[PDB]
Amino acid sequence: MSTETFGFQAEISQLLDLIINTFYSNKEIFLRELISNSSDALDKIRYAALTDPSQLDSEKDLYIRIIPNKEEGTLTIRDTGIGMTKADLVNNLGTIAKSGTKAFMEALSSGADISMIGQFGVGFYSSYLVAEKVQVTTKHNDDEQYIWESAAGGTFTITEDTEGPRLGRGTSMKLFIKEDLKEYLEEKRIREIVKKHSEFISYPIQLVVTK
Numbered sequence: 001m002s003t004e005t006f007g008f009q010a011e012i013s014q015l016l017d018l019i020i021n022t023f024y025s026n027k028e029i030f031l032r033e034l035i036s037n038s039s040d041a042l043d044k045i046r047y048a049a050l051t052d053p054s055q056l057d058s059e060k061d062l063y064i065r066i067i068p069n070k071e072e073g074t075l076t077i078r079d080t081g082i083g084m085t086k087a088d089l090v091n092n093l094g095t096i097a098k099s100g101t102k103a104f105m106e107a108l109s110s111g112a113d114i115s116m117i118g119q120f121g122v123g124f125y126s127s128y129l130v131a132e133k134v135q136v137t138t139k140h141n142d143d144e145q146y147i148w149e150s151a152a153g154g155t156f157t158i159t160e161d162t163e164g165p166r167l168g169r170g171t172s173m174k175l176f177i178k179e180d181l182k183e184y185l186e187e188k189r190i191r192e193i194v195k196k197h198s199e200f201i202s203y204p205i206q207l208v209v210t211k
């Protein structure tokens with residue numbers, strides 16, 4: 001249960017400051033990128049299953065589920081993707097991201113839009129447009145379950161998950177929404193965003209509504 005504290009790569013910290021401290025209007029594009037990242041993770045496990053199906057034993061259902069928690073003020077995006085290993089959390093959210101993170105700001109200096117963040121493979125960091133803190137719970141078939149957490153203060157912590165709920169396989173991403181942005185926890189707002197930005201994705205998008 002030991003927590004290892006790591007620091008963001010310099011370009012990622014530099015980019016993370018550009019997302020938080022700059023004012024943008026349609027911050028709703030974060031959900032498009034988090035669903036798209038969930039869809040890409042779902043693609044990788046079907047392709048792994050085509051090679052070896054024993055990979056779906058962890059969880060046979062492939063879906064994308066959104067769980068807004070108004071009382072906790074969190075938006076959770078759970079998908080049964082291939083998941084990430086402890087190594088992958090550092091090497092997929094870093095190093096591979098460095099070329100894209102730099103290329104994004106090189107495009108942003110050329111006058112690009114914040115919505116193009118997905119074309120540079122760093123669409124996850126757009127979640128900090130609406131989230132003050134992000135808890136990424138992941139589980140890959142060949143590794144253990146880990147909780148990645150960061151408030152974009154230049155440091156991120158990876159914790160081996162031993163007391164949280166089992167995922168089996170996939171990635172559960174808990175976004176701690178800023179108080180002025182609780183609109184992204186409303187039922188109607190989430191759905192009109194999903195239909196607007198993620199209409200044509202192959203996997204089923206699920207929303208947990210509570211009455």
Ligand SMILES: CCNC(=O)c1noc(-c2cc(C(C)C)c(O)cc2O)c1-c1ccc(CN2CCOCC2)cc1
Pocket residue numbers: 033034035037038039040041042044077079081082083084088092120121122124136138170171173
């Ligand atoms: C290495 C094999 N495993 C995975 O790729 C994986 N499993 O779960 C992933 C999710 C990641 C995120 C954020 C933290 C990146 C989500 O919001 C949702 C996921 O399912 C997730 C993932 C999916 C896509 C990406 C970014 N891609 C896409 C753009 O190019 C770079 C790589 C990064 C991570």
